[PDB]
Design a protein around this ligand. Structure first.
Ligand code: AMP
Ligand code: AMP
Lengths: 527, 527
């Protein structure tokens, strides 16, 4: 918000430092000021060109109607002459010259006058299409002749009089075009400087961070801090396998996929494949019982919807584009969900919107080299159910929906019988649009640590302003809404945690009580 | 198969007209035969060049081993000598010349020959480094001298003797490289023209079609035959709504999705969203119970997978590529499933492989615009459970696999309580690599007609050959397998037939008996 950025210089400097955003806020505002000055100059100069061309247009329209109104009997007593009066012959020659005729034969040119297409070509005629050669030939041969004149020619023919009128108006228009050209070329550069400034500004603006909540740790990722843990590291009395080894022992995965599809791919087999789909539906039912509206969505969107969530331009490199298309595969259903209502004024009574959106998800994982190289932790395409909340503009509403979103993910993990913890994310690790982020993490025995499975975020109105999400308040004004989101459940990474936490001594794997109705059994069969 | 193919220039020629396919079989053969010539022309010339580098290679190695094998005291002897003999001066001189530091100062030579790096760099020197002037000079100056002789100088110094063998060897080699110059130069082109034809040739082999089975109707689409019908077109005592209007009545879809994601997109809400996931699980459970192996799969693959099935290049234009990647989004799990075993020799006892793979599916829908533009009939991204079978090269095995593929699809529609019919696909309409194709279509009341939902195909060893799929038979011979496939269930298109066939008077939609246990209810609830 420009005006808000000025009246508040400190708040935004602090926000920018806190988030580790390199944003020069004065250079931004100086782009805005410079643009504004460029636009006013462009407008004065456009006016100057417009005045010039407005000078010569009426004579063209007057002559054009005069030629059209020449009677037929008059076109005939010009076509009749073998032997034209000199001032009359001058007139026709100039018309033939201008029309691009390639013959100065009088007989030949006295003819086009009664062409079915003559007037039609005269009307359609454009003075911008006159060459400088014809232009200079017109001044040398004809303007410079004392008889080449409406007054003088019109006395001799009321057919040639109009035509000399028309030819002169065109020449004058043509000479005005010529005059106006250097201002027009200039205006062209200014106009392009200005467009370039508008894109330079719009892209600074899209970097402005939300001020973070006062309770968030201040620093980079190393300032993230655990606030809670529920359950613990399992203890096995046998020597536990990691998830890859479990899937091998049991025939639950298809390693051959990396030859078909490249690295960071996975393909599940037998009871584990069925388990993945059981998990997505369990999570959708769960979210539906919770009063969130179930949705199934495409995994692609246009640029505008990545712009509105903040995925573009900041995290552009995490996104796969679809070539020879304007479409990009989405990493999360939040991009589609956030975009559904752009441009609408929601009635306050609809508030809040609570969506549980399922979509396949795609990530380039560019820049993940050496991270999670094996198994189910980090893959290119995977399946997620997302919680998305749109809310009226209060901290109270937003604090409330953030609590619910977090309890939902926790209750899901309790039902999955997995040990987890909550982590408060630092201002420098939160991302630019965030008020608060809390990550939920599940204990993964093979790495001896917790690994994220959920990220819960409140944004306030920072997505709302970018995606133009607005609502009407009880008072009758339109305001931008607040938004939040959190994962409900994503596979196959949660499968890593489930395999390792619920592995039994004989290498088989238990199903948690809440998943038994979905699976038809209490133990995954060693296919 | 080149030989086999030519062996029956009539069989392939008939397959080509039968399938309505454009492939000039004569040109392809001409290229293959012509390619065989370029390949000999290249075998020969490559040989003529090894022979020439074979005269000069062994002598350079021996000499390289001779200098490597100079005792370390013949080193002090020559490099501590104050005035040597003129033949040794000459010898060491030649070597300073070859290494690009030519001088006639014994001192400098003295100097150089002493460098720790002296030996290491002659043993590592390559005749390619020797220039024109050096060759010239080493001939005019040093080959010409009569004291420039190994034996003549291997007598005065045991250290400089091997040095002149190395210098002579390196000079003959440099000379060989020089005449082999224009020789090795012709190769580069011949070989590019050779690769060109591999490309043009294998490009055309990929156009070769399979002869259709003898009981497939001949001709175009107009010759497809209805072979069976089950259930009937519904009759309602009310005015039936079309699926888009039923979805609209019940609040089950989000039409805003086309502003976010473009045309041919869809987003389900509420009970219909849930129904979509329930259908996919239902189809998977059913396939498992039929003894097919359930799998969940990615939706992208490298080019090879598409080549292997026949999607490339025949239908490359229905496919979405992923920008700045070597990957493409697959329109059916069949592309991943068929590529899984590329390159393997499957053991006989693994056969047949029966896979029920689930993946999101993507199509560009290029060509088809002004058809099924509104609703769930033709969307860019959808969900599909696919049946895929890989079998022994046996008509017996393929025919049984095809009937079970067909019956699987038929019992799924019956269970879904949907009126359907089966259509025997004609030669001109089955696709290039098909043996048999039976389409199954479901009655859509709003449109007054059956609309395809499944295409059951047998391809014999068409895909095997393209994807290198093979098995070892009981006698222990490696043979290509036969492949088959058919859809199990695809959404959302199946939902358009469900809404409409299943719709009640009051506007709501009934859940067929088989899906009641998946939905927890008998009628779909509106928003
Ligand atoms: N490449 C990936 N592979 C598998 N799961 C992932 C991947 N990226 C993210 N996830 C999961 O999706 C959740 C939300 O991710 P994000 O939207 O990055 O917070 C994470 O906590 C993980 O559950
Ligand atoms: N663009 C699409 N939208 C919805 N369903 C589709 C689409 N393309 C194919 N299908 C479904 O998949 C079935 C078989 O597809 P195929 O694998 O192309 O033989 C069709 O008969 C439809 O049920």
């Amino acid at each position: 918000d420009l005006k808000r950025l000025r009246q508040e210089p400190e708040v935004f400097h602090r926000a920018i430092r806190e988030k580790g955003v390199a944003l020069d806020l004065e250079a931004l505002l100086a782009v805005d000021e410079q643009l504004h000055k460029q636009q006013e100059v462009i407008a004065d100069k456009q006016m100057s060109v417009k005045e010039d061309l407005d000078k010569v247009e009426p004579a063209v329209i007057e002559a054009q109607n005069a030629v059209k109104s020449i009677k037929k009997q008059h076109l005939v007593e010009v076509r009749s002459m073998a032997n034209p009066p000199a001032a009359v012959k001058l007139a026709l020659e100039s018309i033939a010259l201008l029309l691009g005729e390639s013959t100065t034969d009088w007989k030949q040119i006295r003819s086009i006058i009664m062409r079915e297409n003559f007037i039609p070509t005269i009307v359609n005629f454009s003075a911008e299409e006159i060459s400088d050669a014809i232009r200079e030939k017109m001044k040398k041969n004809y303007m410079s002749n004392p008889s080449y004149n409406y007054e003088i020619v019109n006395r001799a023919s009321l057919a040639a009089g109009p035509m000399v009128k028309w030819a002169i108006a065109q020449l004058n228009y043509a000479d005005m075009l010529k005059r106006v050209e250097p201002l027009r070329n200039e205006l062209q550069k200014l106009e392009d400087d200005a467009k370039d400034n508008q894109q330079k500004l719009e892209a600074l603006l899209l970097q402005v961070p939300l001020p973070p909540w006062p309770g968030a740790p201040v620093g980079g990722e190393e300032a993230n801090r655990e606030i809670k843990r529920v359950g613990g590291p399992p203890e096995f009395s046998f020597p536990p396998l990691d998830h890859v080894a479990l899937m091998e022992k049991n025939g639950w995965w298809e390693p051959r996929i990396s030859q078909v599809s490249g690295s960071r791919s996975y393909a599940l087999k037998g009871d584990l494949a069925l388990y993945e789909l059981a998990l997505l539906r369990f999570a959708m039912d769960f979210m539906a019982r919770r009063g969130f509206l179930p949705m199934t969505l495409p995994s692609y969107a246009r640029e505008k919807a990545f712009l509105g969530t903040g995925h573009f331009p900041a995290y552009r490199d995490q996104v796969w584009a679809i070539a020879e298309t304007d479409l990009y595969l989405t990493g999360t259903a939040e991009v589609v969900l956030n975009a559904l209502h752009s441009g609408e004024i929601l009635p306050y009574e609809a508030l809040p919107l609570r969506y549980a959106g399922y979509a396949p998800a795609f990530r380039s994982e560019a820049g993940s080299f050496g991270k999670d190289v094996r198994g189910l932790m980090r893959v290119h395409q995977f399946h997620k159910v997302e919680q998305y909340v749109l809310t009226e503009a209060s901290l109270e509403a937003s604090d409330r929906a953030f609590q619910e979103l977090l309890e939902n993910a926790e209750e899901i993990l309790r039902l999955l019988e997995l040990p987890y913890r909550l982590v408060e994310v630092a201002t420098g690790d939160m991302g630019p649009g965030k008020w608060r982020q809390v990550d939920i993490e599940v204990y993964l025995p093979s790495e001896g640590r917790y690994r994220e499975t959920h990220s819960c975020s409140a944004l306030l109105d920072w997505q709302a302003r970018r995606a133009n999400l607005r609502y009407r308040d009880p008072e009758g004004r339109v305001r931008y809404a607040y938004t939040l989101n959190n994962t409900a459940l994503a596979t196959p990474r949660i499968l890593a945690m489930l395999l390792e936490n619920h592995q039994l001594q004989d290498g088989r794997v238990r199903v948690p009580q809440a998943l038994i109705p979905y699976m038809g059994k209490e133990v995954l069969e060693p296919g």
